[PDB]
Every structure is written in C-alpha cells, then in structure tokens.
Amino acid sequence: VGAXAXVXWXWXWXWX
Amino acid sequence: VGAXAXVXWXWXWXWX
C-alpha cells in the first residue's frame, strides 16, 4: 500500500 | 512495495 507498488502510487493499482 | 505497507517502510515487512 501507499507509494512504490501495490494499492496507491507507482506500480500495481491506483496512480503513477 | 516501497513506502506505506508491504515490502519496504511502514507496515508488513522491512522497516518503520
């Protein structure tokens, strides 16, 4: 979660 | 991964 990969910013799901 | 939860900083595994 949050920032990098997963649920949030960068990779996987959400933004970036 | 990275910063928040998962593999890295904050929650789950790594630091914080």
Short mmCIF file of N, CA and C in Angstrom, two decimals:
data_model
loop_
_atom_site.label_atom_id
_atom_site.label_comp_id
_atom_site.label_asym_id
_atom_site.label_seq_id
_atom_site.Cartn_x
_atom_site.Cartn_y
_atom_site.Cartn_z
N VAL A 1 0.84 -1.21 0.00
CA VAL A 1 0.00 0.00 0.00
C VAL A 1 0.88 1.27 0.00
N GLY A 2 0.39 2.38 -0.57
CA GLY A 2 0.93 3.72 -0.37
C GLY A 2 1.71 4.27 -1.58
N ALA A 3 3.03 4.06 -1.61
CA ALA A 3 3.94 4.62 -2.61
C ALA A 3 5.09 3.66 -2.94
N UNK A 4 5.13 3.17 -4.18
CA UNK A 4 6.12 2.23 -4.71
C UNK A 4 5.42 1.22 -5.64
N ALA A 5 4.89 0.14 -5.05
CA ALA A 5 3.97 -0.80 -5.70
C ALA A 5 2.82 -1.21 -4.77
N UNK A 6 1.71 -1.70 -5.33
CA UNK A 6 0.60 -2.31 -4.59
C UNK A 6 -0.69 -1.49 -4.80
N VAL A 7 -1.31 -1.01 -3.71
CA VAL A 7 -2.51 -0.16 -3.71
C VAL A 7 -2.12 1.29 -3.35
N UNK A 8 -2.01 2.18 -4.35
CA UNK A 8 -1.56 3.57 -4.20
C UNK A 8 -0.78 4.03 -5.45
N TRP A 9 0.37 4.69 -5.25
CA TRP A 9 1.17 5.31 -6.31
C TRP A 9 2.32 4.41 -6.80
N UNK A 10 2.60 4.43 -8.11
CA UNK A 10 3.71 3.73 -8.77
C UNK A 10 3.17 2.54 -9.57
N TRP A 11 3.37 1.31 -9.06
CA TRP A 11 3.03 0.05 -9.72
C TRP A 11 1.81 -0.68 -9.09
N UNK A 12 1.18 -1.56 -9.87
CA UNK A 12 0.03 -2.39 -9.49
C UNK A 12 -1.29 -1.63 -9.75
N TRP A 13 -1.83 -0.94 -8.74
CA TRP A 13 -3.16 -0.31 -8.77
C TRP A 13 -3.18 1.08 -8.10
N UNK A 14 -3.88 2.04 -8.72
CA UNK A 14 -4.17 3.38 -8.18
C UNK A 14 -3.68 4.48 -9.15
N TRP A 15 -2.48 5.03 -8.90
CA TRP A 15 -1.90 6.16 -9.64
C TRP A 15 -0.42 5.95 -10.01
N UNK A 16 0.13 6.86 -10.83
CA UNK A 16 1.52 6.84 -11.27
C UNK A 16 1.74 5.79 -12.37
N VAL B 1 4.97 -2.69 -2.26
CA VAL B 1 6.41 -2.43 -2.12
C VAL B 1 6.67 -0.93 -1.86
N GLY B 2 7.76 -0.59 -1.16
CA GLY B 2 8.32 0.76 -1.10
C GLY B 2 8.07 1.48 0.23
N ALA B 3 6.98 2.25 0.31
CA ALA B 3 6.66 3.13 1.45
C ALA B 3 5.14 3.20 1.70
N UNK B 4 4.68 2.68 2.84
CA UNK B 4 3.29 2.63 3.28
C UNK B 4 3.02 1.29 3.98
N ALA B 5 2.69 0.26 3.20
CA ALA B 5 2.65 -1.14 3.63
C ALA B 5 3.25 -2.08 2.56
N UNK B 6 3.66 -3.29 2.97
CA UNK B 6 4.08 -4.37 2.07
C UNK B 6 5.55 -4.73 2.32
N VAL B 7 6.40 -4.65 1.28
CA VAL B 7 7.85 -4.89 1.34
C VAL B 7 8.61 -3.55 1.25
N UNK B 8 9.08 -3.02 2.38
CA UNK B 8 9.74 -1.70 2.48
C UNK B 8 9.42 -1.04 3.84
N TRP B 9 9.07 0.26 3.83
CA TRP B 9 8.87 1.07 5.02
C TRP B 9 7.38 1.17 5.43
N UNK B 10 7.11 1.17 6.75
CA UNK B 10 5.79 1.35 7.36
C UNK B 10 5.29 0.00 7.92
N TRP B 11 4.33 -0.62 7.23
CA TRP B 11 3.64 -1.86 7.65
C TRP B 11 4.05 -3.11 6.84
N UNK B 12 3.83 -4.29 7.43
CA UNK B 12 4.10 -5.61 6.84
C UNK B 12 5.55 -6.04 7.13
N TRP B 13 6.49 -5.77 6.21
CA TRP B 13 7.87 -6.27 6.26
C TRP B 13 8.90 -5.21 5.81
N UNK B 14 10.03 -5.12 6.53
CA UNK B 14 11.20 -4.31 6.20
C UNK B 14 11.56 -3.35 7.36
N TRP B 15 11.10 -2.09 7.29
CA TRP B 15 11.43 -1.01 8.24
C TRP B 15 10.20 -0.18 8.66
N UNK B 16 10.39 0.70 9.65
CA UNK B 16 9.36 1.59 10.18
C UNK B 16 8.39 0.83 11.10
#
